[PDB]
Amino acid sequence: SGRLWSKAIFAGYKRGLRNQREHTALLKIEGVYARDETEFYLGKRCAYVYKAKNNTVTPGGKPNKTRVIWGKVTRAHGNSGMVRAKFRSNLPAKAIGHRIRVMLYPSRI
Amino acid sequence: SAHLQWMVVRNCSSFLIKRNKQTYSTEPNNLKARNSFRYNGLIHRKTVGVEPAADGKGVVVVIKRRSGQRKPATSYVRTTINKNARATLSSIRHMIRKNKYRPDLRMAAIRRASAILRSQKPVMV
Amino acid sequence: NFAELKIKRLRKKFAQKMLRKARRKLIYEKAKHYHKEYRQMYRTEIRMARMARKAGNFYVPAEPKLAFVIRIRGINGVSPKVRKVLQLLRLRQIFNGTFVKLNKASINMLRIVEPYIAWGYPNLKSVNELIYKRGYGKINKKRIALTDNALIARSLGKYGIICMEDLIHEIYTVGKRFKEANNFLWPFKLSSPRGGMKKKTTHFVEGGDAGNREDQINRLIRRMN
Amino acid sequence: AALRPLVKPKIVKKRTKKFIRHQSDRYVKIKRNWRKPRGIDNRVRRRFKGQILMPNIGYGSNKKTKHMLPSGFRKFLVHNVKELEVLLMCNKSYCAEIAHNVSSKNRKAIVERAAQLAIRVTNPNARL
Amino acid sequence: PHCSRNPVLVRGIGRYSRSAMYSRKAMYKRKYSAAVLATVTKPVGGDKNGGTRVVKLRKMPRYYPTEDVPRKLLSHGKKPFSQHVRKLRASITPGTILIILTGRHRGKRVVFLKQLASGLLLVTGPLVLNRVPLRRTHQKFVIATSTKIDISNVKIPKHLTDAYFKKKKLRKPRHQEGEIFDTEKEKYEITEQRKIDQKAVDSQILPKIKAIPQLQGYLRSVFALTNGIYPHKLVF
RNA sequence: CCCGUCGCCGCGCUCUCCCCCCUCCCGGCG
RNA sequence: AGAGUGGACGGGAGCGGCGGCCCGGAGCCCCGCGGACGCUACGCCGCGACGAGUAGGAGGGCCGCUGCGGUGAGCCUUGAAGCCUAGGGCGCGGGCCCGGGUGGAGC
Ligand SMILES: [Mg+2]
Ligand SMILES: [Mg+2]
Ligand SMILES: [Mg+2]
Ligand SMILES: [Mg+2]
Ligand SMILES: [Mg+2]
Ligand SMILES: [Mg+2]
Ligand SMILES: [Mg+2]
Ligand SMILES: [Mg+2]
């Protein structure tokens, strides 16, 4: 019943032109295209959810094929939406262009 | 002399074991079994060591006599103690502290006696 | 012996506690005096200029005796004379400011190392922020954080400088022991300028940073410490 | 169930990969273990971007956790029962490891003596 | 045992100075110049065994570990969690409607009762509306809306604490090996005191909910995001 | 002596006596 | 119990504080018998600053190879050397240790 997370897109890693830093991720959240709108999402949890072959244990449920890399939004990256986030493990490069959930967790509203 | 004999056997001794980043000693009166000036069982005027007993019950405490310092046959007096644990720790503590016989190896002898006792007591399944 | 000995050491501990209380009261009053002196100086300058305007004349204030200098260029490709002057100024790293006392000799060696430093005249707030946040002293060739008036007094008490307020007073009102106080102070290692610089390699009056910005050094110090 | 160490800090390694030798992937005659590349044009010696890294002392590990096994212990190589008796004090900080040359009956004796002496043994099942 | 006599204005700084506090405490007149057991004795139990036995308490350890750990340093902050200051966000006042975000009751709309003594919020859905009992919920994991129910003069039983809400354990009595299984106690029983507390608090909350219009349908519904609305633009 | 809640720095109360305001096992309760 | 940012006594001659019918003048620890770790001084610990590098120099190497004097009441046909290893590890590294297989006499 109902979505309860905002949809973002893994846009790429933090980088200059010829050096990329894979510990920080760049996220484009749908609907926000300025810094003073990115202010709401500034400490929210975020998740890269994906499927694989083997079964993993699910908290409060039965084992299935879904896996999650957890992270959180850390700050804004440049004048038009585009936050930068920090995950527990660095995100795989096959996730670029794909969906990342922003979870409305720890709440300040 | 203790300092001269230590400067001799400090790096060349048949009791020295240098293996991977650690150093040990195996002389028979060495609490903590380490290559140190404090815990050396041969170079001091006064030494205390503890071992398991001949039968598998009790702890033998061997202290070095004062007089016969060049006669190694009579130079050690050893006593076996086959009491319970608290009394054997209290007795060796009383021995060291009340005799004032080198009272810096007291706690090391205490740890060694408790380890020997715990190893002597029967194993549970 | 175990009663006269214990009452003797108790008396000694009491006397040391009373000496501590005396020195605390002294440094409190000294700081109050300096607050009076600073506000008196500020109102005095304003009154002088205001009196000259009322009379119809001009009041030329005293050209300042204290400057804050910051090395703002790196260490690659530096002239030997510029190198020697910068290390006589104790600017051996980039963003590496210090206090200088302004006279003809010091002004001419700043003019020598003009395109490498940004310098200006600090105000009392800038001297407060600099000594409190980034205050390190040189105590037998080591760089020690100024956390203790005992540390300051054990190095500089022979000049009457026994607290951080005494240090700030000497540096701001350049006293007779300014050389000793400024040499006690380790050169300040500032951060990068938050917000940027708009051009590093040209003079401030033509749109850059180098040279003598007069009191815009305080803006730079706020952004940089 | 097992014998715990005294303390168990989190071991932090600055690098888990090995330092392989330049062009050891390109040849069989070049072994994997490290040689420092001396050579006037050599780009890993010159430290160009994206190349093989060279070992240096800044990779050195914290001396509180140096030589520490992944379970809080430091290893000591043992050949017989007397060498186990020398490890009685360490206990919570040093574990034993029977050497590869020790035969079946003697390592049976060693594992029995270490069991009754509460010393940790890294390879307790080696001929059974 | 007097009160503080020096009201604070900013923490760490009292309002009245040192001499003013000297005068207010009146230290000009009240200056003051100057001014187990470890062992017991149990009886004899004779005869020919004479002399009462002097027996000490807390005897010496019969074992010392072969290496010990050195003690810590002193840190001066760092109070335990029971003594921490519990803070609450200003938008959550008693009667506010919150949205549970994370539990089994994800996206649900409840009302806010008292905040408990461990920082956790005590909420209830009116269980006949959205199947949410009296529960605790975290302030960081609720969203606070702007709709109110004035819950003054609602009797809260005093036996409604964190000990009342703390989970219960039964495994495992006296058994060390497990091959047989304990097929009971997985059914968490709703106790009769919990049911009657629920009945009482719902009987005194629900007529106030039926008062304002459409609120019971609003509390029956759940919260969700669709193809339009973005949470940074939503007013709650 | 079961186990250094300690130094410096900033404070609060008591070893003086009066008040007054909400309270309270309240004791009987209107 | 080691205690000294001055300690000595000892007549000398007076106080403050405890013992009154105004006269004063030692407690040598203990109901307990006890009190973590350390200091291979070639060791251990603290603080501050610093770290590019060819040719070249120097230091350390519990890096490695072969043999000799000693030492390990060392190891080994209940399996040595050597070799193989999608096994477990250590070390910045040189390298090393352990598990499994193969092998068959020394290390
Ligand atoms: Mg240049
Ligand atoms: Mg910025
Ligand atoms: Mg140029
Ligand atoms: Mg490695
Ligand atoms: Mg190769
Ligand atoms: Mg070249
Ligand atoms: Mg170098
Ligand atoms: Mg083999």
| Longest CA–CA separation in chain D, Å | 61
Rounded to whole angstroms, how far apart are CA atoms E59 and E57?
6
Contacts of E60 (CB under 8 A, 6+ apart): B86, B89, B90
* CA C39 to chain centroid: 19
Closest CA to C219 of C111, C131, C120: C120
H or E segment to which residue B73 belongs: none
Residue C7, CB, less than 7 Å from strand G?
no
User: In angstroms, what is the span from residue C77 Cα to ligand 3's centroid?
Assistant: 9
Q: Is the CB of D99 under 7 A from strand G?
A: yes
How far apart are alpha carbons C166 and B45 in whole angstroms?
Answer: 61
Q: Residues 6 or more apart from C154 whose CB is under 8 A from it?
A: C139
In angstroms, rounded to a whole number, what is the distance separating the alpha carbons of residues C222 and C216? 10
User: Residue C222 C-alpha to ligand 2 middle, in angstroms?
Assistant: 15
CA distances from E220 to C216, E125, E214, E216 (A): 63, 9, 10, 6
Q: What does the block give as tokens for E180?
A: 């047989």
* Closest CA relative to residue C131, chosen from C174, C90, C93, C163: C163
Sequence-separated (6 or more) residues with CB below 8 Å from residue C171: C66, C99, C127, C131, C178, C181, C182, C185
Residues 6+ apart with CB under 8 A from C125: C218
Backbone angles phi, psi at B90, to 5 degrees: -65, -35
Q: How far in angstroms lies nucleotide G14's C1' from the CA of residue C13? A: 28
C-alpha to C-alpha distance for B99 and B109, rounded to whole angstroms: 15
Q: How far is D41 from chain B (nearest CA, A)?
A: 39
**Centroid of ligand 2 to alpha carbon of E89 (angstroms):** 29
Distance between CA atoms of residues C58 and C56, nearest Å = 7
Q: What b/e sequence results for B4-23 when a residue is b if at least 16 CB atoms lie within 10 Å of its CB, and e otherwise? A: eeeeebeeeeebebeeeebe
Nearest alpha carbon to residue A70 among A105, A45, A43: A45
Q: Which nucleotides of G are covered by protein (CB under 7 A)?
A: 1, 4-8, 17, 26-28, 31-42, 47-55, 62, 71-81, 88-100, 106
Chain A residue at shortest CA distance from E145: A109
- C142 CA → ligand 6 middle, Å: 40
Cβ separation D89–E65 shorter than 8 A: no
* C1' (G84) to CA (B33) span, angstroms: 40
Given D6, D90, D91, which is nearest E69 (Cβ)? Answer: D6
D→B interface, C-beta within 8 Å: 67, 74-77, 82-83, 85-89, 91, 94, 115-118
Q: For residue D121, what is the DSSP state?
A: B
Alpha carbon distance E204, D74 (integer Å) = 66
Q: Which of B32, B34, B59, B118 is the best residue to mutate to test the E interface, defined by the most E CB atoms within 10 Å of its own CB?
A: B118
Q: Which of residues 66-85 of B touch strand G (CB under 7 A)?
A: none
Residues D51 and D47: their CA atoms lie apart, in Å, by 7
Q: Which residues of B touch D87 (CB under 8 A)?
A: 24, 33
Distance A27 CA to ligand 2 centre (A): 18
- Chain-centroid distance of CA E46 in Å reads 57
Task: Read off the amino acid at residue E173.
Answer: P
- What region, left, alpha or beta, does residue B106 occupy, with left being phi > 0 and alpha being psi -120 to 50 degrees? alpha
Residue numbers in E near A2 (CB within 8 A): 107, 222-225
Chain B residues with beta carbon closer than 8 angstroms to that of E64: 89, 107, 110-111, 114
Nearest protein residue, CA measured to C1' of G37: E70
Euclidean distance between CA atoms C99 and C89, whole angstroms? 9
d(CA A88, CA A22): 12
- How does strand B48-52 pair with strand C136-139? unpaired
> Do C107 and C85 touch, CB atoms closer than 8 A?
no
> Is the Cα dihedral E15, E19, E22, E24 positive or negative?
negative
Of all nucleotides in the shown strands, which has a C1' nearest the CA of D55?
G92
- In degrees and rounded to multiples of 5, residue B100 shows phi and psi of 55, 40
CB contact under 8 A, E64 and B90: no
CA C63 to chain centre: 18
Letter string b/e over residues E120-149, b meaning 16 or more CB atoms within 10 A of that residue's CB: bbbbbbbeebbebbbbebbbebbbbbeeeb
Q: State the DSSP code for E39.
A: E
Q: E66 in contact with D at a CB cutoff of 8 Å?
A: yes
3-state secondary structure of A84: strand
Rounded to 10 degrees, the C-alpha dihedral D98/D104/D108/D113 comes to: -40
- Rounded to whole angstroms, the Cα distance separating E123 from E100 reads 10
The amino acid that residue B118 corresponds to is: R
Token pair in block for residue A29: 């959240």
Degrees to nearest 5, angle at CA E58 with E56 and E60: 95
Quickly give E73 CA vs G14 C1' distance in Å. Answer: 52
CA distance A92 to D87: 47
The helix (run of H) or strand (run of E) holding residue A87 is: strand A83-87
| C181 CA vs G74 C1’ separation (Å) | 68
Residues 6+ apart with CB under 8 A from E40: E54, E55, E57
Listed by number, the residues of chain B in 96-115 with a beta carbon closer than 8 Å to a beta carbon of chain D are: 111-112, 115
Closest CA to E138 of E89, E95, E96, E94: E89
The length of chain C is 225
Size of interface B-E (CB pairs under 8 A): 26
Distance G68 C1' – D91 CA (angstroms): 39
Residue E59 approaches strand G within 7 Å at CB: no
Q: C150-153, long-range: CB within 8 Å, 24+ apart, which pairs?
A: none
The residues near D56 (Cβ < 8 Å, ≥ 6 apart) are: none
Question: Solved how?
Answer: cryo-EM
Interchain proximity A41–E232, CB inside 8 Å: yes
CA of C119 to the centre of ligand 1 (A): 21
Whether the CB-CB separation of C62 and C103 falls below 8 Å is answered with no
- The sign of the torsion formed by the CA atoms of E200, E205, E208, E214 equals negative
**Residue E179 Cα to chain centre, angstroms:** 38
A66 within 8 A of A49, measured Cβ to Cβ: yes
Question: Are B and D close enough to touch, i.e. 3+ CB pairs under 8 angstroms?
Answer: yes
Find out whether C201 and C110 touch, Cβ atoms under 8 Å. no
C-beta atoms of A6 and E230 within 8 A = yes
Q: In angstroms, what is the resolution? A: 2.8
Transcribe A15-63 into DSSP letters. Answer: E-SS-EEEEEEEEEETT--SHHHHGGGTT-EEEEEEEEEEEE--TTS--
The answer, for A36 touching chain E at a CB cutoff of 8 Å, is no
Q: In this complex, do B22 and D117 lie within 8 Å of one another by their Cβ atoms?
A: no
Does A109 lie at the interface with E, CB-CB under 8 angstroms? yes
